[PDB]
């Protein structure tokens, strides 16, 4: 999932952009993925 | 009166150039809706101008290779650009020039002389061309083409596939890989095919449908779901 980032491959953005701009893009991937775990864990805790 | 027919599942093309396998890949692009009416045309003993819409799905069941190319443009009165795709002698010619058409363009064929069909340089589609902003040069059969303008590009997809059926579209599935991407950058609202005069061919109209594509292990689309 892109999560609003320009591309979903973490290694593309870093090759395609500077560190200053990648911060804006990557932190959209992290905040998205890191949230997609907190969804998974929350599913387990309930299911467990 | 042009007859209709049923498009079946035809009209799926590789959306992008990235190889995949064993994966169901949802994608949204301009596709031919499944089971949509596709207009059906004749060559017997008939090449109207057609609305180009968003993109056109062209499927020509042929034997003697009658249909040699297409003509694109908004007006076709020589007051605007026009795209001319012509295939003769296996050679492809693409010109965006602005040129004044004959009202029923065709390319010539003379039956059984030392040069079959002759008429290779016959070049009666048009009076003459002035400003040319682009150039390129190079029923047992079924050839399918997808034509679309994406943000000024002009994209063409194709499959050259053998079949045995006389009457109708083959019921089945084939995925169209990309051929070229001529950057003509012109407004195309209408088009007219070309014919070789001494061969039915189909026209669908794409829509922004969303398909789910199934890539098999060799990286080919073996099925689809609209």
């Amino acid at each position: 999932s892109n999560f609003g980032a320009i591309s979903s491959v973490l290694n593309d953005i870093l090759s395609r952009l500077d560190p200053p701009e990648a911060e804006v893009q990557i932190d959209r991937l992290i905040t998205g993925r890191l949230q997609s775990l907190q969804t998974y864990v929350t599913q387990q805790l309930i299911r467990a | 009166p042009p007859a209709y027919t049923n498009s079946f599942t035809r009209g799926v093309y590789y959306p992008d150039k990235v190889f995949r396998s064993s994966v169901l890949h949802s994608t949204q692009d301009l596709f031919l809706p499944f089971f949509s009416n596709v207009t059906w045309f004749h060559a017997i003993h008939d090449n109207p101008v057609l609305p180009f819409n968003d993109g056109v799905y062209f499927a020509s069941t042929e034997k003697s290779n009658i249909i040699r190319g297409w003509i694109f443009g908004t007006t076709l009165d020589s007051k605007t650009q026009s795209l001319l795709i012509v295939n003769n002698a296996t050679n492809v010619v693409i010109k965006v020039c602005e040129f004044q058409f004959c009202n029923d363009p065709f390319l010539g064929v003379y039956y059984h002389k030392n040069n079959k069909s002759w008429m290779e340089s016959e070049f009666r589609v048009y009076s003459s061309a002035n400003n040319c902003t682009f150039e390129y040069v190079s029923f047992k059969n079924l050839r399918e083409f997808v034509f679309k303008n994406i943000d000024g590009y002009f994209k063409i997809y194709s499959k050259h596939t053998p079949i045995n059926l006389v009457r109708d579209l083959p019921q089945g599935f084939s995925a169209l890989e990309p051929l070229v991407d001529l950057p003509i950058g012109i407004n195309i609202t209408r088009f007219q095919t070309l014919l070789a005069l001494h061969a039915a061919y189909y026209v669908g109209y794409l829509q922004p449908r969303t398909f789910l594509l199934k890539y098999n292990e060799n990286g080919t689309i073996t099925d689809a779901v609209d």
Binding site: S7, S8, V9, L10, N11, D12, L14, S15, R16, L17, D18, P20, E21 | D16, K17, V18, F19, R20, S21, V23, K79, T80, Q81, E98, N131, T133, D151, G152, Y153, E177, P178, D181, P183, G185, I186, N187, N218, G219
Partner: protein, 328 residues
């Protein structure tokens, strides 16, 4: 935190006391041995002479579009020149321009008035952006401009732009038609008149005009970057290839860390990169000699640090998960 499997836990717990138990540290990861850079081999230099030094740039209403292919980006050679009054790259960060090979590269060259270089950018509007030239909203490329006022100026009326058009263009659309524009109801019948305007109005350029009217030469590149077979490459040499060992790779600008292996996957001629369920690139095609490499990431398998309380004893016993005991 990197000292040894024990101290890897204390950083996790944020504690110097580690209670008796089992703790699973991050999967053990192998640092990349060496760097690989693999680009297609071609010695040619892109026509930076025939794009940037060209003697006549076409007018903006009909702008030339020149496909650039099979060359190495000479980008370091532009530095002795009139340079650039604006260089603005929408898709790429300009630092990466060297590290990264391109795909469909079209230089679109035309001469516009000074004030209007602003108007070339995705989203802008005005006389240039609306009528005679337009850029996509997703545009990926660079927009380069430098004043030609020492050349294009004499009054030079040849450079010319489309003032009137019924509606706005689509991206990268060209309309060179001169047919008269009808302001009111009455047909113009192909002649100027009241509420009839010849749509193309020529710029004047004197050599003495203010910076607003000094003609700038704009050249707008375009490219797809990844996803596509590379043609135009960067000024970066290619190294030797390493198989079956953890490496740090650059293939056609795609970078990462992987273990490059051979593969039987068969790409259609137009396909370059393969991708996975996770869309991380699984397989690439070696650009110099065409063959399909599987990229398998390093760092597989979990670690678990079995320890009695560091309060008691400082010895630990590590549990590597699903490896027969050889590799580590």
């Amino acid at each position: 935190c990197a000292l040894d499997p024990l101290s890897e836990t204390k950083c996790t717990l944020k504690s110097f006391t580690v209670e008796k138990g089992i703790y699973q540290t991050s999967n053990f990861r192998v640092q990349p041995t060496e760097s690989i850079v693999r680009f297609p081999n071609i010695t040619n230099l892109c026509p930076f002479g025939e794009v940037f030094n060209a003697t006549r740039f076409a007018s903006v209403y009909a702008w030339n579009r020149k496909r650039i292919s099979n060359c190495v980006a000479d980008y370091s050679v532009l530095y002795n020149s009139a340079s650039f009054s604006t260089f603005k790259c929408y898709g790429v960060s300009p630092t990466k321009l060297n590290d990264l090979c391109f795909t469909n590269v079209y230089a679109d060259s035309f001469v516009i008035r000074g004030d209007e270089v602003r108007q070339i950018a995705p989203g802008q509007t005005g006389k240039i952006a609306d009528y005679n030239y337009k850029l996509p909203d997703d545009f990926t490329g660079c927009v380069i401009a430098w004043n030609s006022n020492n050349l294009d100026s004499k009054g030079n009326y040849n450079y010319l732009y489309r003032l009137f058009r019924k509606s706005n263009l689509k991206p990268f659309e060209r309309d060179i038609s001169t047919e008269i524009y009808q302001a009111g109801s009455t047909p113009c019948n192909g002649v100027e008149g009241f509420n009839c305007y010849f749509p193309l109005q020529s710029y004047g350029f004197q050599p003495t005009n203010g910076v607003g009217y000094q003609p700038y030469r704009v050249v707008v590149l375009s490219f797809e970057l990844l996803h596509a077979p590379a043609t135009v490459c960067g000024p970066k040499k290619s190294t030797n290839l390493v198989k079956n060992k953890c490496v740090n790779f650059n293939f056609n600008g795609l970078t990462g860390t992987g273990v490059l292996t051979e593969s039987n996957k068969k790409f259609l001629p137009f396909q370059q990169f393969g991708r996975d369920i996770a869309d991380t690139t699984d397989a690439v095609r070696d650009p110099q000699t065409l063959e399909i490499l599987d990229i398998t990431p390093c760092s597989f398998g979990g670690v678990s640090v079995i320890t009695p309380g560091t309060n008691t004893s400082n010895q630990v016993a590590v549990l590597y998960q699903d490896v027969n005991c050889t590799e580590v």
